[PDB]
Design a protein around this ligand. Sequence first.
Ligand SMILES: Cc1cc(O)c(C)c(C)c1O
Ligand SMILES: [Fe+3]
Length: 463
Amino acid sequence: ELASTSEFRFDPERTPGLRHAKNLTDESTRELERVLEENHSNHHIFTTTEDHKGVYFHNHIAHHDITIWALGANPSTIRSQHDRNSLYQRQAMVIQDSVVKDMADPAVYKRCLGREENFLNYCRFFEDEINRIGYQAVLQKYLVDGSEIADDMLCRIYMGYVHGIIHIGMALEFKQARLLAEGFAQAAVHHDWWYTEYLTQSEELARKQEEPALPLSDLIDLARQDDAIRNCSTLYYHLQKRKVTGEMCLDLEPARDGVLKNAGPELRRVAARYRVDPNDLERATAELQNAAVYLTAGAQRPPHICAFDFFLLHSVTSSIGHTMFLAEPSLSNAQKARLLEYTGRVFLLSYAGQGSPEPRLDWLASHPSRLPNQGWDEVFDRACYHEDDGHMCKLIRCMAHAEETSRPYDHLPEFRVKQGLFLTAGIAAIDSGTDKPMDGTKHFDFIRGSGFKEAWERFPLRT
Ligand SMILES: Cc1cc(O)c(C)c(C)c1O
Ligand SMILES: [Fe+3]
């Protein structure tokens, strides 16, 4: 199954992922293995120091390179995209082999957590663990077996806007033990303590079963009806400037400083109702994936062009990984259910942070295609040439996957996004794209604070 911990090895037929272009070339695949190893060896998992912008910005190079290979990028496009995103990277941390070995003492493992200088140390520790006990046993030991170490790591994969679970999802999907170690290592060095508190306190509350279980889509809607949740945040988190230089920062963080400060008990009471049925996982997985497209693609405002929220779209891109968790024999139905629950509860926290935008699927559905005769194949190809850090192509590929996992359940009311709206949402995403989507690490094509009317002021009106 999983390629070597020591090397990246992709094949257009053996490792094409759950959703992809037609006719992936060996040439693109070799170029991809080249740039991935350059990225692993030369670039740190964070592209900023924490104090620079106030929160860590993440290295998306692994995710972008893989995604645009999967969508049929030529070797030249892979190189060009990778080279441009390489320019703002931090230099990789040093590996100390004595620390890698000492991390087998749980006291030492625990002492190294939350420290970015340990990123390649943890990568090697996880590569070693995979080779020692195999990946399936790593998932038990470091995620689902309910040890203090596995419960700690289960919260970390969601820290830093769920980049750990995104990385782990991609590793299982593309069958790379080397990317899986990267994933556990990314999670290990995060230190967003409020995720541990929210997910731990929410699981404890859910155990009491005080109110009935709802689909994620119903809980997105329930959050909006709540006075404390709908008012707990502000657009000000996306407009903060440093007093001295006027530079952008996230010194205040919507989740820590807004959602959990102002509406903690109210949100935990909603989160406690996302309880997933172990006997119904194919539908329950597809429903979480639909619900991510609902809250994200739904977050539109007439009379503006369709635009996608930078923070909400990590719900869609994180969501794909549960298709791999579902397909994994070594995980119990109960472990698979718990993973889904954690992901869903984070989706609610993220949604509240962005002002809980009321879905306007009517406005999304009437999106006028900039170009004629666009199907997924045409959208995928345009996503290859979109010059960001990979958010746009991951959003599009993950929505195309949700369309497929939803098709069997298109008649059920808890599936708010119906089959035709997925391609419309894909066209609306690529159509919102411009000729200069980024400047270094700054994004311009995504909205920030879609739930706040003022966020939409710099977005053109639909013609
Ligand atoms: C560009 C960019 C990358 C990131 O990973 C995160 C987390 C933020 C807030 C950003 O603005
Ligand atoms: Fe991201």
